[PDB]
Amino acid sequence: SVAHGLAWSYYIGYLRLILPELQARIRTYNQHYNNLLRGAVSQRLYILLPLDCGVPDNLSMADPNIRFLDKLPQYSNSIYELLENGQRAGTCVLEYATPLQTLFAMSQYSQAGFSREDRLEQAKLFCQTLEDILADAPESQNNCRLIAYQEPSSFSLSQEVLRHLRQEE
Amino acid sequence: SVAHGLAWSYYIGYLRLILPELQARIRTYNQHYNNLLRGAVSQRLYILLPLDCGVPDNLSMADPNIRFLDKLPQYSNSIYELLENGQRAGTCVLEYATPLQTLFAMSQYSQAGFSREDRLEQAKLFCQTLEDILADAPESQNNCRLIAYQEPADDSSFSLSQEVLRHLRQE
Ligand SMILES: [Ca+2]
Numbered sequence: 001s002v003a004h005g006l007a008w009s010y011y012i013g014y015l016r017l018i019l020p021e022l023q024a025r026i027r028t029y030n031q032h033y034n035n036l037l038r039g040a041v042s043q044r045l046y047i048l049l050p051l052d053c054g055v056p057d058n059l060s061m062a063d064p065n066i067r068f069l070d071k072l073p074q075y076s077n078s079i080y081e082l083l084e085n086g087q088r089a090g091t092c093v094l095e096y097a098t099p100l101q102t103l104f105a106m107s108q109y110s111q112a113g114f115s116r117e118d119r120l121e122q123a124k125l126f127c128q129t130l131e132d133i134l135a136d137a138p139e140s141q142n143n144c145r146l147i148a149y150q151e152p153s154s155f156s157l158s159q160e161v162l163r164h165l166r167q168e169e
Numbered sequence: 170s171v172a173h174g175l176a177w178s179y180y181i182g183y184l185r186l187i188l189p190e191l192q193a194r195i196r197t198y199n200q201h202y203n204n205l206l207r208g209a210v211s212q213r214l215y216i217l218l219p220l221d222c223g224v225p226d227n228l229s230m231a232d233p234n235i236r237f238l239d240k241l242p243q244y245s246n247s248i249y250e251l252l253e254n255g256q257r258a259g260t261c262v263l264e265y266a267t268p269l270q271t272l273f274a275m276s277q278y279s280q281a282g283f284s285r286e287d288r289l290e291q292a293k294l295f296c297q298t299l300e301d302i303l304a305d306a307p308e309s310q311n312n313c314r315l316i317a318y319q320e321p322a323d324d325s326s327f328s329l330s331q332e333v334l335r336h337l338r339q340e
């Protein structure tokens with residue numbers, strides 16, 4: 001199954017390299033660059049895992065309640081404000097799990113012999129494998145949170161992130 | 170096994186995106202940028218696949234007979250000259266298969282429970298899977314050559330430049 005290699009590549013080649021300095025970079029931002037009133041950026045890296053593997057080109061312009069705030073100083077990571085009831089309800093470092101783009105592309109390539117059913121199953125296995133790797137990983141010190149979801153009826157991505165953000169604090 | 174996902178990620182996220190424009194970039198370089206008094210760059214992307222997963226940070230430090238010439242204009246790809254008997258024997262776009270660095274890193278990470286034997290098996294599977302993908306792939310139009318190799322225990326019986334040259338001469 002492709003999910004196993006995708007989760008290991010993502011952890012080894014990316015997460016284990018960015019997670020150790022993440023809390024220091026967020027701290028730097030909150031203390032020296034953040035001008036929001038009671039808008040401290042949450043301490044975890046929030047990873048969007050749409051199980052449908054639909055990764056847009058621009059995160060921000062996919063939900064009006066998710067607005068780009070700043071680049072996280074010191075790799076390119078972005079800070080977003082999350083709105084609820086028309087007001088800022090939270091701020092976090094947020095991004096899509098790029099290996100889902102591979103699963104989407106494989107389902108779009110007839111020679112891969114990879115159905116939408118195979119894609120959904122591998123997306124769930126990728127999530128489960130990555131969760132398992134991070135649970136045993138020394139770099140993951142209350143540093144990373146996976147946000148896996150499916151669409152049902154309108155969907156609110158901001159509400160999904162906020163439920164995880166509130167689970168932190 | 171990790172090799173399947175690594176091969177598919179490498180093809181989807183890299184090879185299929187770079188290979189369609191490769192021939193045009195090489196042709197542009199040979200016509201407009203290459204020095205007048207030197208060889209034309211060969212037309213394929215040569216991918217080094219050491220089965221031991223030993224990927225160097227440069228490429229030249231692995232062999233004095235492989236010398237950096239230029240960056241290929243228009244994704245960062247590099248052109249190298251290959252030497253044989255101290256002289257220029259070929260010129261090509263060359264690079265290591267970066268997913269082998271994942272296999273190497275997993276073998277050093279105790280929590281992965283991934284031995285050197287497991288790493289070698291996955292390196293072979295990665296090569297076989299990638300070859301199978303490329304064989305059926307539309308982007309691969311006499312555009313890519315995988316160079317997989319096992320390094321013998323006797324150092325004197327293997328030369329990386331000689332391995333690239335055998336494939337370059339096959340072209
Ligand atoms: Ca030896």
